[PDB]
Amino acid sequence: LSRFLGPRYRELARNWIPTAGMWGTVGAVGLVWATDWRLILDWVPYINGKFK
Amino acid sequence: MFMRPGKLSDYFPKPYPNPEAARAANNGALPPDLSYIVRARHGGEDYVFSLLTG
Amino acid sequence: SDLELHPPSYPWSHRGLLSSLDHTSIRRGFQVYKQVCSSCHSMDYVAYRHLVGVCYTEEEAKALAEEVEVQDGPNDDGEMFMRPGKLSDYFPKPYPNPEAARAANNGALPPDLSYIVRARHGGEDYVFSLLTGYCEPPTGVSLREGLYFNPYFPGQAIGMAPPIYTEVLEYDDGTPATMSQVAKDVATFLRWASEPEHDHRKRMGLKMLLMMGLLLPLTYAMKRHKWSVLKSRKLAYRPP
Amino acid sequence: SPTIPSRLYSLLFRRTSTFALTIAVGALFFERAFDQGADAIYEHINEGKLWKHIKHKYEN
Amino acid sequence: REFGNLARIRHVISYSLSPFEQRAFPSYFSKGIPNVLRRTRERILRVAPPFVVVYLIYTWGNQEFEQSKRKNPAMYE
Amino acid sequence: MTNMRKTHPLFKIINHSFIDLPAPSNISSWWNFGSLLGVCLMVQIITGLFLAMHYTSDTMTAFSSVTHICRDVNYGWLIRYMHANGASMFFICLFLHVGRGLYYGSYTFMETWNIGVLLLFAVMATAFMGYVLPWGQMSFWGATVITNLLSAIPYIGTTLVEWIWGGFSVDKATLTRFFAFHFILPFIIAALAIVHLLFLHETGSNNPTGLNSDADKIPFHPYYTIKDILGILIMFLILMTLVLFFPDMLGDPDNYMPANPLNTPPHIKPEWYFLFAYAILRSIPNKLGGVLALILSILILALMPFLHTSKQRSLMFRPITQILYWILVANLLILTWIGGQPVEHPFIIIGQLASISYFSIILILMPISGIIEDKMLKLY
Amino acid sequence: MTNMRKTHPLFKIINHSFIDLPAPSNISSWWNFGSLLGVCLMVQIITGLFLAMHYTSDTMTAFSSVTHICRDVNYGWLIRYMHANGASMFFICLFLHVGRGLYYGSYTFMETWNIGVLLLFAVMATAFMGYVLPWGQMSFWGATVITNLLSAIPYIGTTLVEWIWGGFSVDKATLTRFFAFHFILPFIIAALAIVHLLFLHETGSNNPTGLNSDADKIPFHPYYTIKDILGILIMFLILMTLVLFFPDMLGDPDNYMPANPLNTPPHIKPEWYFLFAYAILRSIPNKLGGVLALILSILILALMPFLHTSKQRSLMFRPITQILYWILVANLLILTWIGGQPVEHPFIIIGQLASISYFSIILILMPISGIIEDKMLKLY
Amino acid sequence: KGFSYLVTATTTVGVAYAAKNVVSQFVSSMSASADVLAMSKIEIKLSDIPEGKNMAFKWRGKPLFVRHRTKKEIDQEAAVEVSQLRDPQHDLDRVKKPEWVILIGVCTHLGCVPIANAGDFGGYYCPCHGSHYDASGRIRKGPAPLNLEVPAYEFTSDDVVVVG
């Protein structure tokens, strides 16, 4: 509750924003690559070729 | 196929070959298989007795 | 007799590890089966939906599905009736039970031609040698009626009339219908019937070979990298 | 001029999140590239035998 | 975690008898019925009334369902 | 010489887990139900092994094989009814295990509680596909109902239900894959039970007082061995009186017909242990809301250890939460009866009030009442 | 702050077993076969789970179900051939595992060796019943032949055979019960493999030198992690090059025919490990003698820890016994070829000489070679 | 480090690609097979439907009700408003052919098949939770959330209807 509400924990969180966002980006691209998500993969120019 | 007097291992013969001919010959309604009608009706033997005598 | 004649190793167009089947020959062999071999032999496991995408187009496969008739039902009276077949149906059986086959073919049951290549030793080589190897028996052995000599058949006496000859059927693409060509076409079509996953399996194998030829040097590189700490490690003993 | 392995390590291979990101992007692009190349090798080996090779005399 | 040491105990004396030298059902009724009745008195008011409400609204739901089954004479003409 | 029991590795594992285990000396009959659950799992494994020994998974021959087991196989009817009533009494002992966990403060074992929640999900799924297996009328229609329940998810649900179906309806592929899944899942349950016991042995066992039992403990042998043996024999009395005297009060007569896709039963219900979740999903008038209600209602078990807002572990000194807990049990009985009865007046509003009271009690009323008892006993 | 890997109990077990396991740094490529056996077991479990997801065990529909898997199920041909060739790869890695133990003296770990022998028996039974499962000509006739082998036992043979058959022949009851046993038995194999690994982990692994490996010991990670990864990759290479190019070089052609009880094949050949067993069976020309010969030929592996009379653990430094061991592998190969061949001249006398040489070279000749080596090294 | 991690990156790209393909192999193996996709197209319903009667067949594996409708039924369906039901729909926008109506008989509360020729609205009466439906499947009295789906059919010559 109030344990993680302070300036030190806030600046730790701000330091970890780019890493957490990068890991979320990795998870998103891995999800669309594994599931072959059409709605995202009809925009990148090369991978558009195989779906036709 | 031929005819043969049935031995002990044979089951009871169906009066109709397939259920749709039974439905046609019995005016729409299909007579169900009474091998689990007691376990398949709410009441069982009481339901059967009341249905026949009611 | 107790002897058997091993069929030779024919150079098939699909004998290579990455060589696919010739689908023109497959559809020619399908025609050979349809107006040659379908009178006696059956195919319980090959359908017109399997014919779509390999042998014929969808419309042509559908049309040859309505060129046969299939028992189906029940109707409103609960009786079986004839209906034109469709792409979902299997190949029509010539006899309802094997005893009809025994009665019609003089006590000999033609086996199902759906796994005959995977079932006989040699496979399509055996089928080709059996079909092309009909000859008169040697002097001294005698065979009764309905039995014919064949060196490749075990027991040397097969119950089969010589099924194919020159100009037994007419092809559609203008290929000459000689007996060797008909035997080759029906052999490769039986090979496809016994293994519909041939071309796809070989494409899978080529992909697997390329990726493992890429991955074994790289995984070996990781193993030698992680093990280089130990493989170049040096020891010294310094007693007082 | 820095060497391209040094540039690769400085940009992508240093942080583990960027390492995983370039692994996944390379996975997608490499899967596309090898799908194209492997099928092209297959039809070049089996020219004139496949169903799409013989298909053009039966649709039209 | 192991049976040799779990907690620190001082000055505690335990007396125990042999199972083959003492009875297995010592006063099972005379000292048994008052004990279970005392336990029932202790924990009867926190358990029973919710199930009384279960039975009450069970009967009420059955009665309302049967009344919805029953028709009404709002249809005279 | 040496002590083989505590020096041989398998023997010392068995001794340290089951023989010389320091157990609390005062645990009541409610602590027998873990061993009852394990012996239920063993009994169901054996009886279902015999049922699959004499059972074929095909929609043309599933009911025929069930009839063959019932009549032709020597004591096959006994094995089949033993399996069915064993599953039902397995769920009875599961509910009593969970009730002991909520009452005597056993949810403070976080990892053990989460493993138990995963075990609960696994056993409900396993018994759902087992009820799918005999291919009865209500069996097939309940399979369709639960698959549509999973299909309530938007943009993923129709593909997921076509994947689970193996097609577009419950058919031969669905029945065969459900046979495979129902066969495999009890062994995953057994492995998760090994993990369950490992976590429990790491964290120790709990007593009804909710206190530190380390002052007075006894070995598990012979006290709890003979106590759980008495529990096993009472177990077997109840299980076989269900099997041999009243076999059909827990089953459904509509299960004794061949699965007709064309005919629909007029009153469709799952078997009695799904009745509360079925009631709350029928209470909430939305597919997405109903399926989330079911999943979150089972997940309140795992979410519960974060709701412990009392400095006293068990309820055995906390009478206001005892009243609230028995109201919770009463509400679960109401939800079971509501799931049993169909959708007319006033079953809709009774089930809605029951679900609302259930959620409000298990999220809101217990922690506030715990704070109230802390202020009452002057903890702060 | 603490070490979660060395503190959390599941993570502690994984760390002490597979991560921070003290492993000898000099174990050869022959030590990867334990991990290969585990990986093939997992592959077989998953692949058979999918096969039974699409498989119905009934004599009318077993062959049709296998054909439907191979033809109409998406990539079910890959699933089925992966299962068959993975069973073959399992037996290849299993024989190499046994040969590693024989050559490096790992049988001195008596409990681990006996658990391995039980595992080998379980794998034989599993593979036999799985080969019965597709209901081919070879399946039915190998089942009848091996069940008559069981019938060779006096005064109980007929009763046990009619009990195993579920009747008086291989029939629907036999097929369904073999489906049940074949599905369930690899989980018993997995449990026995856990016991196998526990008994090994008590005393640590063995080095090819046969010496005390505590001098130079390294953690199992990342060295043997990446070594086993490379071994898994190479095993996958061989396995799926078999699957995708030669899926039937280890199978049988006439197995692909429907099982006709009236018709019989000209030759009887199971898979090549059972060809070894079949050659040992038919070397001795009486039924009970052949059955005892087969059983004794499997139990001599368990008997061999009592046959080690040399003062040197491994065969690394004993060259005569290396010659004896490779003569042993030589007539393993010869007996496999004879079991492949039909029983006529000269295969009869070749198989008899091979079997008597096999039993002699294991029972009486290797201890003589060991004591001669000890005499020559001035150890006696 | 760039060279070593490049080797590691390429081999883990290869491993991830292979794992993706084999997991997709398994998932596609558990999906629908070629035969059940082949019978996803229903057979011909012909003209055996009686006047004012309904027939339930197996179309796309599910129960499909094909029912004959009368002129009075068509007039009542036209008289029923679009927005007066739970969802905005009309009979003209639902069924192109007014003589025969083909629908998928799955109710919108628990997915039961309604019993034909029943209910107070003249349509169907699904009794699992008590939902009545009109001739077009519109929900007027019941707990169903949505309406009954009408399958996308096609009409050849008058004895041939292709539904799938």
Ligand SMILES: CCCCCCCCCCCCCCCCCC(=O)OC[C@H](COP(=O)(O)OCCN)OC(=O)CCCCCCCCCCCCCCCCC
């Ligand atoms: C005495 C030989 C002297 C050779 C001198 C060679 C040069 C030495 C000086 C230079 C060094 C060269 C490299 C040395 C490598 C290691 C040493 C070596 O190879 O020694 C020879 C080797 C071992 O010698 P040792 O074991 O002492 O022989 C006893 C005889 N049994 O022994 C051998 O290699 C001989 C192996 C013969 C095996 C014959 C087996 C015949 C039977 C096989 C049956 C298989 C089953 C068939 C089926 C049976 C049933 C039908």
Ligand code: HEC
């Ligand atoms: C009716 C006269 C047939 C014609 C036309 C074809 N086949 Fe024949 N087949 C027939 C019979 C009566 C038998 C069994 C005969 C016997 O002695 O067993 C068979 C069997 C086969 C076999 C199996 C041979 C074996 O060694 O097992 C094959 C490979 C075979 N038939 C091939 C075959 C082909 C390819 C045909 C089309 C050209 C064909 N047969 C036509 C009956 C008849």
Ligand code: HEM
């Ligand atoms: C499904 C099969 C299950 C098995 C085989 C099993 C096994 C066991 C056993 C043998 C015990 C010891 C007996 C006892 O302590 O009373 C136990 C205790 C426990 N179980 Fe389970 N259990 C199962 C399910 C569950 C479930 C569903 C939950 C919770 C939702 C759960 C949570 C717990 C907890 C917290 C304990 C510790 C109680 C204490 O220490 O007093 N388990 N379990």
Ligand code: HEM
């Ligand atoms: C290895 C373990 C098991 C096997 C092999 C197995 C096998 C089977 C088989 C073959 C059936 C079909 C017979 C029938 O329907 O009567 C069945 C039914 C059933 N199984 Fe299992 N089972 C196992 C464990 C379990 C478990 C752990 C549960 C519950 C959690 C369970 C619950 C059920 C139920 C409820 C039925 C329905 C029986 C009926 O409604 O009549 N089974 N099982």
Ligand code: HEM
């Ligand atoms: C059937 C499934 C089996 C599995 C899953 C299995 C598993 C394993 C594993 C993972 C190892 C560690 C790897 C290694 O030490 O090389 C191992 C080692 C060992 N296995 Fe097995 N094994 C099986 C069968 C056998 C058999 C059939 C035997 C003997 C007849 C056996 C005897 C041994 C021995 C003695 C070791 C110790 C090796 C050493 O000390 O270096 N196992 N096993």
Ligand code: HEM
């Ligand atoms: C949980 C584990 C397993 C399951 C569920 C399973 C299931 C099956 C099924 C359903 C079949 C028949 C499908 C077909 O043959 O087309 C089969 C065949 C077979 N299984 Fe298994 N199996 C398992 C493990 C194993 C193991 C561990 C082995 C060997 C060590 C094995 C060896 C075989 C063999 C040899 C066949 C016959 C393949 C052929 O005839 O070509 N299986 N299995």
Ligand code: FES
């Ligand atoms: S499912 Fe039709 S009324 Fe509820």
